[PDB]
Design an enzyme around this catalytic site. Structure first.
Site, PDB file in Angstrom:
ATOM      1  CB  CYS B 105      -2.883  -4.503  -7.350  1.00 10.74           C
ATOM      2  SG  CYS B 105      -3.732  -2.972  -6.944  1.00 10.74           S
ATOM      3  CG  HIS B 125      -5.143  -1.839  -3.466  1.00 11.47           C
ATOM      4  ND1 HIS B 125      -6.103  -1.142  -2.770  1.00 11.47           N
ATOM      5  CD2 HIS B 125      -4.220  -0.927  -3.845  1.00 11.47           C
ATOM      6  CE1 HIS B 125      -5.797   0.142  -2.761  1.00 11.47           C
ATOM      7  NE2 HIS B 125      -4.648   0.295  -3.393  1.00 11.47           N
TER       8      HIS B 125
END
Ligand SMILES: *[C@@]1(=O)C(=O)[N]C2=[C][C]=[C][C]=C21
Ligand SMILES: *[C@@]1(=O)C(=O)[N]C2=[C][C]=[C][C]=C21
Ligand SMILES: [Cl-]
Ligand SMILES: [Cl-]
Lengths: 187, 187
Positions: B105, B125
């Protein structure tokens, strides 16, 4: 007014099935209370992750009722929920007021133990099917998430996002669920 | 001999991205240490789930080295990891010994901060891409999980199972990963 969720956290709960719904519901603006079955102390989950509950179940019950009561799975967690008189009382009350009850993996076997939602279509983890279906009090489904009115069930760690988003959809609507879903990078 | 994983847990870590890899790795028989960046006390994750670490980072470092060092995401968690001299030292050591580093992420932005794995193909992400790519020190990928040698990255909460299973495959092999995967009820 914000919707409110009670997540009941017992020793041996599946930590993924506990954390994913808590987190996703909070992303949806739901006020979530992680309530410790045994009291206020940290809870040792199934794979040894230790989570500190927001409150004891005894204390959280006093702030009820909730728009959803959520039962994580984990075999030993579900057994602890199934054996609990406090859980029985909470679920009976929720059923009687026509509030949502959500359970995942082995979690739905606590509905059986407490005689909740008989006649509903339900799913469980494949390994929990025989336990859930003892007496034929439910109709079994292999859907990843099953929602039969106010009984919402799901199958496993790998269905936890779908389960959580279904709770969000039930409480806050399709559009909020879609908005919460997009940043998660789900398949 | 069992493989060993260090998961570094900072305030503001994404709790799903922390718990899913811990749980899945433990299912694979990996000895996992959840190490608190700030010390031994419970950690308030991004969506307010509170996790009690197994040990402080200071104490876990003494039991190193580990077969994998895992960096969860969460923007504020990743920033705390990025600002940490102890994390820098741990990652440099791991890189130098040709050990696996895994980040998800916003987690991979700590690799940038600590100058780890430059030249690797990486994902993050979508919202963390610009930060990761500042200076063009990596090549960007939109794959849900990206593994370029000993740098393994992934995108979000919804890729956490894939990320975790890729770590399992790297450490314990394809067959163990497949066996761990089946009971999870993944799509
Ligand atoms: C799940 O968490 C449960 O309740 N029972 C089970 C069996 C295998 C994998 C996950 C689970
Ligand atoms: C993730 O956990 C992160 O590090 N940044 C981010 C943004 C949106 C959703 C999830 C994450
Ligand atoms: Cl279990
Ligand atoms: Cl975040």
């Amino acid at each position: 007014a914000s919707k409110r969720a009670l997540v009941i956290l017992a020793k041996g709960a599946e930590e993924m099935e506990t954390v994913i719904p808590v987190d996703v519901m909070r992303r949806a603006g739901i006020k979530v209370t992680v309530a410790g079955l045994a009291g206020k102390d940290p809870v040792q989950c199934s794979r040894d992750v230790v989570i500190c509950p927001d409150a004891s179940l005894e204390d959280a019950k006093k702030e009820g009722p909730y728009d959803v009561v959520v039962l994580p799975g984990g075999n030993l967690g579900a057994q602890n929920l199934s054996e609990s008189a406090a859980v029985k009382e909470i679920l009976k009350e929720q059923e009687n007021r026509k509030g949502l009850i959500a359970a995942i993996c082995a979690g739905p076997t606590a509905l059986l133990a407490h005689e909740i939602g008989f006649g509903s279509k339900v799913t469980t983890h494949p390994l929990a099917k025989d336990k859930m279906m003892n007496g034929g009090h439910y109709t079994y489904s292999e859907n990843r998430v099953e929602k039969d009115g106010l009984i919402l069930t799901s199958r496993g760690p790998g269905t936890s996002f779908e389960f959580a988003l279904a709770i969000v959809e039930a409480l806050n609507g399709k559009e909020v669920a879609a908005q919460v879903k997009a940043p998660l990078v789900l398949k």
